[PDB]
Amino acid sequence: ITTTKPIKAHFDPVADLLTKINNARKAKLMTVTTIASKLKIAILEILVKEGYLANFQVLENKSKTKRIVTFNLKYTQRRIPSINGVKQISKPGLRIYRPFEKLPLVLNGLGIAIISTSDGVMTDKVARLKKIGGEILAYVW
Amino acid sequence: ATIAQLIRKPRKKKKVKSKSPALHYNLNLLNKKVTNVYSPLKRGVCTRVGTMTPKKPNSALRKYAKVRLTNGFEVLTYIPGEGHNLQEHSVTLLRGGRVKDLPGVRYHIVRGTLDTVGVEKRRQQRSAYGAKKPK
Amino acid sequence: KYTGSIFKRSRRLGFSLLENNKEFSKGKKRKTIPGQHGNRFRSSTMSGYAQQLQEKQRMQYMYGITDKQFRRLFRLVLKQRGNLAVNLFRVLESRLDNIVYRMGFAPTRRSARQLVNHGHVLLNDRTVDTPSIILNPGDKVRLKAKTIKIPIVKAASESGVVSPFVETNNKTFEGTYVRFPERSELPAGINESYVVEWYKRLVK
Amino acid sequence: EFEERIVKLKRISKTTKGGRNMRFSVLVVVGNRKGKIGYGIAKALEVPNAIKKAIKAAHNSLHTIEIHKGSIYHEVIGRSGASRVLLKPAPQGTGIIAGGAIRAIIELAGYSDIYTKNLGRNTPINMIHATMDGILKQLSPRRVAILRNKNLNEL
RNA sequence: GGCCGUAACUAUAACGGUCCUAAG
RNA sequence: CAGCUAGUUGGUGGGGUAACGGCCUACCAAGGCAAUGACGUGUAGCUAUGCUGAGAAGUAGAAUAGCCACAAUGGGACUG
RNA sequence: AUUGGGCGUAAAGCAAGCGCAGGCGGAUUGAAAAGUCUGGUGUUAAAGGCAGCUGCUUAACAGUUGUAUGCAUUGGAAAC
RNA sequence: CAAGGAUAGCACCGGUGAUUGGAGUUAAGUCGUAACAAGGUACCCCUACGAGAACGUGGGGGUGGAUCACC
RNA sequence: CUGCUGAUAAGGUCUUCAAAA
Ligand SMILES: [Mg+2]
Ligand SMILES: [Mg+2]
Ligand SMILES: [Mg+2]
Ligand SMILES: [Mg+2]
Ligand SMILES: [Mg+2]
Ligand SMILES: [Mg+2]
Ligand SMILES: [Mg+2]
Ligand SMILES: [Mg+2]
Ligand SMILES: [Mg+2]
Ligand SMILES: [Mg+2]
Ligand SMILES: [Mg+2]
Ligand SMILES: [Mg+2]
Ligand SMILES: [Mg+2]
Ligand SMILES: [Mg+2]
Ligand SMILES: [Mg+2]
Ligand SMILES: [Mg+2]
Ligand SMILES: [Mg+2]
Ligand SMILES: [Mg+2]
Ligand SMILES: [Mg+2]
Ligand SMILES: [Mg+2]
Ligand SMILES: [Mg+2]
Ligand SMILES: [Mg+2]
Ligand SMILES: [Mg+2]
Numbered sequence: 001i002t003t004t005k006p007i008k009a010h011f012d013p014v015a016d017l018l019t020k021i022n023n024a025r026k027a028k029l030m031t032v033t034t035i036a037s038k039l040k041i042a043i044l045e046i047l048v049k050e051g052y053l054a055n056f057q058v059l060e061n062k063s064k065t066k067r068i069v070t071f072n073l074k075y076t077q078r079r080i081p082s083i084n085g086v087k088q089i090s091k092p093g094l095r096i097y098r099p100f101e102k103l104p105l106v107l108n109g110l111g112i113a114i115i116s117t118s119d120g121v122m123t124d125k126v127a128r129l130k131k132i133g134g135e136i137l138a139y140v141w
Numbered sequence: 142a143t144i145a146q147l148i149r150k151p152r153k154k155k156k157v158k159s160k161s162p163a164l165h166y167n168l169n170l171l172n173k174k175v176t177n178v179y180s181p182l183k184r185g186v187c188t189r190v191g192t193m194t195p196k197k198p199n200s201a202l203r204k205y206a207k208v209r210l211t212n213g214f215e216v217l218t219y220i221p222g223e224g225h226n227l228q229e230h231s232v233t234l235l236r237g238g239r240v241k242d243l244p245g246v247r248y249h250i251v252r253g254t255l256d257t258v259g260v261e262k263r264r265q266q267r268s269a270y271g272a273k274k275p276k
Numbered sequence: 277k278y279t280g281s282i283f284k285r286s287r288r289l290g291f292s293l294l295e296n297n298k299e300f301s302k303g304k305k306r307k308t309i310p311g312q313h314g315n316r317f318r319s320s321t322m323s324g325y326a327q328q329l330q331e332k333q334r335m336q337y338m339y340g341i342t343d344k345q346f347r348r349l350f351r352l353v354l355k356q357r358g359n360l361a362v363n364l365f366r367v368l369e370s371r372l373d374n375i376v377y378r379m380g381f382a383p384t385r386r387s388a389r390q391l392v393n394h395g396h397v398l399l400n401d402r403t404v405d406t407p408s409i410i411l412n413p414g415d416k417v418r419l420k421a422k423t424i425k426i427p428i429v430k431a432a433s434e435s436g437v438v439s440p441f442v443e444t445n446n447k448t449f450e451g452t453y454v455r456f457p458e459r460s461e462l463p464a465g466i467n468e469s470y471v472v473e474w475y476k477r478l479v480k
Numbered sequence: 481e482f483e484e485r486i487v488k489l490k491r492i493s494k495t496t497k498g499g500r501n502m503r504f505s506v507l508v509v510v511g512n513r514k515g516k517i518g519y520g521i522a523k524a525l526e527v528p529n530a531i532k533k534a535i536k537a538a539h540n541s542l543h544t545i546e547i548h549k550g551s552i553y554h555e556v557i558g559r560s561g562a563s564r565v566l567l568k569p570a571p572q573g574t575g576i577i578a579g580g581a582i583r584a585i586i587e588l589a590g591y592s593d594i595y596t597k598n599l600g601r602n603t604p605i606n607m608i609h610a611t612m613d614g615i616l617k618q619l620s621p622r623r624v625a626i627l628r629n630k631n632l633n634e635l
Numbered sequence: 636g637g638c639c640g641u642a643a644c645u646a647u648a649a650c651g652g653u654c655c656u657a658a659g
Numbered sequence: 660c661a662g663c664u665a666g667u668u669g670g671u672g673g674g675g676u677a678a679c680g681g682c683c684u685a686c687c688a689a690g691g692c693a694a695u696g697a698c699g700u701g702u703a704g705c706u707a708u709g710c711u712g713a714g715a716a717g718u719a720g721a722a723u724a725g726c727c728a729c730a731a732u733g734g735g736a737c738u739g
Numbered sequence: 740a741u742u743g744g745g746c747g748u749a750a751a752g753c754a755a756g757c758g759c760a761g762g763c764g765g766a767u768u769g770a771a772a773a774g775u776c777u778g779g780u781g782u783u784a785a786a787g788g789c790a791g792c793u794g795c796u797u798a799a800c801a802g803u804u805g806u807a808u809g810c811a812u813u814g815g816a817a818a819c
Numbered sequence: 820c821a822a823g824g825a826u827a828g829c830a831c832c833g834g835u836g837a838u839u840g841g842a843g844u845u846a847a848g849u850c851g852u853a854a855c856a857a858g859g860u861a862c863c864c865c866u867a868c869g870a871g872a873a874c875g876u877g878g879g880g881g882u883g884g885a886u887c888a889c890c
Numbered sequence: 891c892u893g894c895u896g897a898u899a900a901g902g903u904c905u906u907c908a909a910a911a
Binding site: 039065 | 741762763764765766767774775776777816817818819
């Protein structure tokens with residue numbers, strides 16, 4: 001796939017993606033691109049699994065020195081998205097660590113909470129099933 | 142503000158001041174030191190009795206007294222009653238309060254507990270004014 | 277310790293002791309709020325606080341209860357499992373003198389309380405003098421024997437008019453009680469559950 | 481049986497060439513206690529006509545409310561101007577923990593047990609706007625299932 | 636450089652009137 | 660309240676202490692702490708807890724219980 | 740106002756810049772495991788709090804059983 | 820070795836003090852009319868000088884200024 | 891087409907109410 005515009009990204013990997021997603025949702029935009037990091041790749045994989053996005057697709061330069069991830073939002077026929085809001089918890093500076101006992105439940109289970117405990121990012125329900133917790137990245141509902 | 146900013150300079154809470162400061166000063170009288178011990182009501186001795194004029198809207202002559210307490214503070218105190226036996230030199234027992242008309246007055250005199258006589262000719266709300274039950 | 281103007285209180289609240297004996301009366305059939313200022317306007321639009329207080333007063337005057345006792349019972353019931361709208365009703369109705377009234381051995385609730393205080397009532401396996409003991413369905417509350425010969429025993433033993441939730445085994449005055457009273461047996465004098473919310477606010 | 485209750489009766493006025501024109505404004509909340517509730521604010525020279533117009537507006541603008549087990553499904557914050565109202569689900573038994581305009585709206589809508597708190601201003605019209613926004617923004621647990629292709633709220 | 640009058644307890648005069656001088 | 664500290668910091672031999680130790684001693688060195696708050700001033704027994712708060716926490720350290728210090732003020736020591 | 744506030748006109752962006760220390764910080768690989776998560780062990784005195792029960796005519800109250808939090812050590816996890 | 824006593828100069832804190840400076844509060848005091856409209860000399864900010872007093876004027880800066888006006 | 895043009899003692903009513911027809 002060929003591009004024309006330069007691609008930049010913020011230094012904060014969770015909130016960069018969150019800002020991109022929120023702006024695309026508010027502006028009804030469908031496809032967005034950003035620089036690819038492995039945390040972002042895993043988080044997009046779990047978003048696609050949970051069904052908040054249509055597809056995410058990683059690409060590499062011809063010299064294998066740069067990688068960028070482009071993803072599309074899942075709009076219905078009447079063009080209203082599945083994402084309703086995003087809020088980041090573990091911002092730089094103040095990192096949020098919660099044990100299993102205090103693993104949050106987002107919107108009474110309607111939304112999902114992204115938790116990167118020890119096996120990569122992990123949804124709240126599967127984290128509860130595994131009885132182990134860790135860093136809490138963002139709230140998506 | 143910012144986590145680092147609050148870590149460096151934490152939140153300082155605004156102070157709280159009392160409404161009747163003169164009732165919380167105790168003078169030892171042997172070492173001559175004043176300590177901050179809270180007391181509900183305190184005994185004082187009057188120096189000058191008279192009348193003052195209420196501030197803007199009200200118009201009257203309200204009975205005040207310059208009373209010096211058991212400590213070394215002299216306060217202007219309103220006598221709550223109709224008619225008084227204060228004779229410019231007597232022992233009274235002040236409690237907290239605040240009459241809105243007279244500026245600077247922030248205490249009241251309990252009626253009918255000590256040298257100051259009670260308020261007779263009263264059958265309603267007399268327990269506040271120190272009046273014996275008619276029976 | 278109770279008011280001596282139950283007529284006045286019944287006329288104010290509007291609800292009597294479920295018999296209308298203090299409303300029918302022998303004079304004037306008065307069903308207005310007492311005092312000179314009884315026949316005036318501004319009837320409805322009672323505030324939320326006003327109606328909550330009125331309902332609470334009706335509830336805690338229907339049984340002759342002091343508000344502090346009401347707070348005590350509510351603090352007792354509140355902690356258990358969950359929604360106890362079926363438990364706190366039994367708690368409120370389980371009074372000993374109240375059980376004596378629904379037994380039918382006294383003309384009035386406070387007269388039954390007076391008899392209980394004076395000691396003409398027994399219990400399952402003990403004796404009771406205080407008219408506030410919390411009871412549980414199953415205790416054989418057998419009446420006294422020397423009180424069955426008192427010049428005022430006729431209406432006492434005329435208990436054939438009895439509530440279904442107090443079972444006496446008539447002519448034996450055994451007077452136990454099972455099948456706790458339902459909201460049907462607790463008439464429309466006070467049938468509300470936001471007095472619970474009022475005591476939830478005013479009592480932690 | 482669309483019950484109605486008066487929330488606020490203000491005495492607004494304008495100034496003319498000599499004197500003041502005074503009109504009463506009423507804020508009425510109309511609800512059937514089954515899922516339909518609206519609000520209406522009206523002004524008139526007299527209280528009866530003001531109430532009539534306010535009830536007419538409230539019945540003209542009715543909104544549909546969905547309840548889950550007698551309560552609100554998920555915690556929400558309704559924003560309207562400087563008034564922010566926080567609603568939180570409650571178990572069956574706590575009753576209405578609301579007071580004032582929020583309490584009127586919740587009772588007339590039909591909810592049984594709700595935790596509420598007014599975090600902002602205390603003007604009844606804006607508090608009602610915030611409460612209505614919070615209840616309207618609510619998501620059922622079937623719309624989210626349809627959106628995310630889950631199985632009717634199954635895990 | 637003078638003189639006279641003047642403020643809602645008294646007291647005083649912020650203020651006002653006027654004569655003269657090169658200027659007070 | 661921006662400098663404080665000269666047994667203060669460190670080394671050698673000996674003494675003293677139930678014990679290690681500038682605890683003390685004689686000799687040789689100039690170090691030690693301090694803007695991540697020394698030092699100075701003010702105040703206070705500390706804690707389990709009491710009261711309050713949805714919670715984070717605010718406030719008092721009743722009664723009682725653990726520990727510390729004192730016995731008119733200031734020093735010394737015997738017995739054990 | 741960490742949870743939980745703001746700085747155009749209502750209190751609040753230093754007159755502007757060069758900037759040490761501090762805070763934050765691009766992408767990938769390896770190691771260790773200081774933070775983070777989790778298992779075992781020791782301890783966190785008794786009384787107090789909450790839940791259950793018994794005894795005082797019921798209660799207040801007394802008694803009885805259960806009931807956390809943090810620290811240390813040891814054994815694993817490696818996403819940040 | 821050493822509590823205490825005497826003598827001596829520094830250090831910090833407290834009370835009070837003739838006289839004096841300003842401040843707040845005060846139903847109906849005197850002198851002016853500085854500001855709010857183009858407030859009758861547009862106002863405001865920094866600054867220097869001067870005057871019974873609000874304030875006046877010079878220097879720089881702003882619109883948080885009225886009228887004006889264009890088919 | 892720009893003369894001059896200063897001041898006005900104190901405290902105060904006035905919305906009773908919609909429950910409803
Ligand atoms: Mg005219
Ligand atoms: Mg709070
Ligand atoms: Mg103690
Ligand atoms: Mg003590
Ligand atoms: Mg002594
Ligand atoms: Mg010995
Ligand atoms: Mg604010
Ligand atoms: Mg400002
Ligand atoms: Mg600037
Ligand atoms: Mg500035
Ligand atoms: Mg730079
Ligand atoms: Mg640097
Ligand atoms: Mg990185
Ligand atoms: Mg313990
Ligand atoms: Mg106990
Ligand atoms: Mg002017
Ligand atoms: Mg001017
Ligand atoms: Mg002059
Ligand atoms: Mg000049
Ligand atoms: Mg100028
Ligand atoms: Mg000139
Ligand atoms: Mg002229
Ligand atoms: Mg004048």
